């Protein structure tokens, strides 16, 4: 089966992850 | 008297508050 990945417009969660 | 609450499109101030 085939699907589409939905991407959030906000990367700041991952940047907060990196900083923390 | 009634009014409408205006919400900012950016939540990262509160997330920075939490992390800090």
């Amino acid at each position: 089966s085939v699907e589409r990945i939905k991407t959030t417009s906000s990367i700041e969660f991952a940047r907060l992850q990196f900083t923390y």
Side-chain angles (χ1 to χ4, degrees), chain A:
Chain A
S1 188
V2 298
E3 65 183 1
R4 277 185 281 161
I5 291 142
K6 300 294 187 291
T7 305
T8 181
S9 296
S10 180
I11 193 52
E12 294 294 328
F13 77 101
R15 309 205 75 182
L16 287 165
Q17 197 64 72
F18 180 93
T19 315
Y20 180 89

PDB file of all heavy atoms in Angstrom, chain A residues 1 7 9 18-19:
ATOM      1  N   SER A   1       0.831  -1.202   0.000  1.00  0.00           N
ATOM      2  CA  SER A   1       0.000   0.000   0.000  1.00  0.00           C
ATOM      3  C   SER A   1       0.867   1.254   0.000  1.00  0.00           C
ATOM      4  O   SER A   1       2.034   1.214   0.386  1.00  0.00           O
ATOM      5  CB  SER A   1      -0.939   0.001   1.205  1.00  0.00           C
ATOM      6  OG  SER A   1      -1.868   1.069   1.124  1.00  0.00           O
ATOM      7  N   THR A   7       3.749  16.476   7.083  1.00  0.00           N
ATOM      8  CA  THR A   7       4.826  17.157   7.788  1.00  0.00           C
ATOM      9  C   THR A   7       4.283  18.398   8.479  1.00  0.00           C
ATOM     10  O   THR A   7       3.554  19.185   7.867  1.00  0.00           O
ATOM     11  CB  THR A   7       5.951  17.543   6.826  1.00  0.00           C
ATOM     12  OG1 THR A   7       6.391  16.380   6.118  1.00  0.00           O
ATOM     13  CG2 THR A   7       7.126  18.134   7.588  1.00  0.00           C
ATOM     14  N   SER A   9       4.438  22.152  10.080  1.00  0.00           N
ATOM     15  CA  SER A   9       5.093  23.387   9.669  1.00  0.00           C
ATOM     16  C   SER A   9       6.053  23.925  10.719  1.00  0.00           C
ATOM     17  O   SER A   9       6.767  24.894  10.441  1.00  0.00           O
ATOM     18  CB  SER A   9       4.049  24.459   9.348  1.00  0.00           C
ATOM     19  OG  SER A   9       3.253  24.089   8.238  1.00  0.00           O
ATOM     20  N   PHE A  18      16.913  19.508  20.717  1.00  0.00           N
ATOM     21  CA  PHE A  18      18.366  19.610  20.609  1.00  0.00           C
ATOM     22  C   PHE A  18      18.945  20.460  21.736  1.00  0.00           C
ATOM     23  O   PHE A  18      19.906  20.057  22.403  1.00  0.00           O
ATOM     24  CB  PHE A  18      18.746  20.185  19.241  1.00  0.00           C
ATOM     25  CG  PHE A  18      20.229  20.334  19.029  1.00  0.00           C
ATOM     26  CD1 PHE A  18      20.959  19.326  18.424  1.00  0.00           C
ATOM     27  CD2 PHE A  18      20.893  21.483  19.434  1.00  0.00           C
ATOM     28  CE1 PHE A  18      22.320  19.457  18.228  1.00  0.00           C
ATOM     29  CE2 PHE A  18      22.254  21.619  19.240  1.00  0.00           C
ATOM     30  CZ  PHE A  18      22.968  20.604  18.636  1.00  0.00           C
ATOM     31  N   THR A  19      18.369  21.644  21.960  1.00  0.00           N
ATOM     32  CA  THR A  19      18.896  22.544  22.985  1.00  0.00           C
ATOM     33  C   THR A  19      18.797  21.919  24.372  1.00  0.00           C
ATOM     34  O   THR A  19      19.758  21.951  25.157  1.00  0.00           O
ATOM     35  CB  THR A  19      18.150  23.880  22.944  1.00  0.00           C
ATOM     36  OG1 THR A  19      18.020  24.316  21.585  1.00  0.00           O
ATOM     37  CG2 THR A  19      18.899  24.936  23.745  1.00  0.00           C
TER      38      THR A  19
END
